[PDB]
Structures are given as C-alpha cells and as structure tokens.
Amino acid sequence: DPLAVAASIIGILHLILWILDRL
Amino acid sequence: DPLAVAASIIGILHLILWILDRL
Amino acid sequence: DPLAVAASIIGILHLILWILDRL
Amino acid sequence: DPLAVAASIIGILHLILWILDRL
Ligand SMILES: CCCCCCCC/C=C\CCCCCCCC(=O)OC[C@H](O)CO
Ligand SMILES: CCCCCCCC/C=C\CCCCCCCC(=O)OC[C@H](O)CO
Ligand SMILES: CCCCCCCC/C=C\CCCCCCCC(=O)OC[C@H](O)CO
Ligand SMILES: N[C@H]1CCC2(CC1)[C@H]1C[C@@H]3C[C@@H](C[C@H]2C3)C1
Ligand SMILES: [Cl-]
C-alpha cells in the first residue's frame, strides 16, 4: 500500500525532526 | 481499512501543519 | 492488527491534542 | 510489514515523548 508506505516514512521523519527541534 | 486510511492522511497532514507552525 | 489499530487511534488522538495545545 | 510495525512503534513513542514534553 503506497499510502501506508508514505505515512510510515512521514511519521519516522516527523519524530526525528521533532526530536531535533526539541533538542 | 478506513482507520488506517484516515490515520495515514492525518499523519501526513500533521507533519505538514507542524512544520508550517514551526516555520 | 492490534498494533496498527492502536497506532491509528493514537495518531488521530495526537493530531487532536497537538492542535488543541497550539490553539 | 516491518515498515508499518516500526512506524506504529514510532507513533506510540512520539505521543509518549510529546505528552511528556508538554507536561
Ligand atoms: C524543499 C523542502 C524545504 C523545507 C523548507 C526550508 C525552509 C526553511 C526556512 C527557514 C528556516 C529558518 C529557521 C531555522 C530552523 C528552525 C526551525 C526548525 O527547527 O524546524 C525544522 C523542522 O523540520 C521543523 O521544526
Ligand atoms: C483518548 C483519551 C484522550 C484524553 C485526553 C486528555 C485531555 C487532557 C486532560 C485534561 C486537560 C487539563 C486541562 C488543562 C488544559 C491544557 C491541555 C492539556 O494539558 O492536555 C494535555 C496535553 O498537553 C494536550 O492539551
Ligand atoms: C525509546 C527510548 C527513548 C529514550 C528516552 C530519552 C529521554 C532522555 C531525556 C533527556 C536527556 C536529554 C535532554 C534533552 C532535553 C529534551 C527533553 C525531551 O526529550 O523531551 C521529551 C521529554 O520526555 C520531556 O522533555
Ligand atoms: N501516526 C500514523 C498512524 C497511522 C499509521 C502511520 C502512522 C500507522 C502505521 C501504518 C499502519 C497504521 C496506519 C498508518 C500506517 C498505523
Ligand atoms: Cl510542539
């Protein structure tokens, strides 16, 4: 499922960027 | 699955909106 | 899949809670 | 799907970390 693939990549990137902004 | 579909859309929108708010 | 189900519910909830916190 | 599983775990962790940060 392409939608699931995109959402997974987006969530992983989202958590990383949020951690980097909090740091 | 409607729940997976809605959650994927919402995660994509959540990343978009969060980034725009941080900018 | 209970993990996917819980993650979908939780992602919806996370967007709700973040929008309300920023507002 | 390992990608979906990793992203689900990541989403649960993200809500946990974000809630702890807001509190
Ligand atoms: C093609 C995709 C390009 C993406 C758009 C690039 C534009 C960035 C503009 C100004 C940044 C200046 C602010 C310096 C960094 C602080 C904001 C921040 O930390 O955000 C990063 C994270 O993705 C969310 O917070
Ligand atoms: C599925 C279950 C969802 C349960 C949802 C829990 C609601 C939070 C409880 C009380 C808010 C306390 C009133 C103070 C208002 C600040 C908002 C707040 O602290 O909520 C936690 C989080 O930071 C986002 O708002
Ligand atoms: C899956 C494992 C995750 C491991 C958990 C690591 C927690 C380490 C926290 C601070 C050390 C670095 C200080 C960084 C300060 C940012 C604080 C932060 O991490 O935000 C979330 C936290 O629960 C509220 O702030
Ligand atoms: N925060 C979101 C919640 C929804 C999912 C992406 C991340 C998550 C992982 C996959 C399987 C379901 C639906 C999406 C794809 C649960
Ligand atoms: Cl935030």
End-to-end CA distance of chain D: 33
Pick from B10, B11, D3: which is nearest to A1 by CA? Answer: D3
End-to-end CA distance of chain B: 34
- The SS3 of residue B17 is helix
Dmax over CA atoms of chain D, in Å, equals 33
- Per the CB < 8 A criterion, the answer to whether B10 and C11 are in contact is yes
Q: How many contacts (CB atoms, under 8 Å) link C and D?
A: 26
Q: By what technique were these coordinates determined? A: X-ray
Cβ of C14 and D12 within 8 Å? no
DSSP letter, residue C13? H
* Tokens 């949020």 sit on residue: A18
How far apart are the C-alpha atoms of B2 and C7, rounded to whole Å? 13
Does residue A4 sit at the D interface (CB-CB below 8 Å)?
A: yes
Chain C interface, mutation test: which of D1, D5, D15, most C Cβ atoms within 10 Å? D15
Of all residues in chain A, the one with the smallest CA distance to B17 is: A14
User: Residues B22, C4, C8, C11: is their CA dihedral positive or negative?
Assistant: negative
* Contact partners, residue A17, CB within 8 Å, separation at least 6: B19
Pick from A20, A4, B6, A2: which is nearest to C8 by CA? Answer: B6
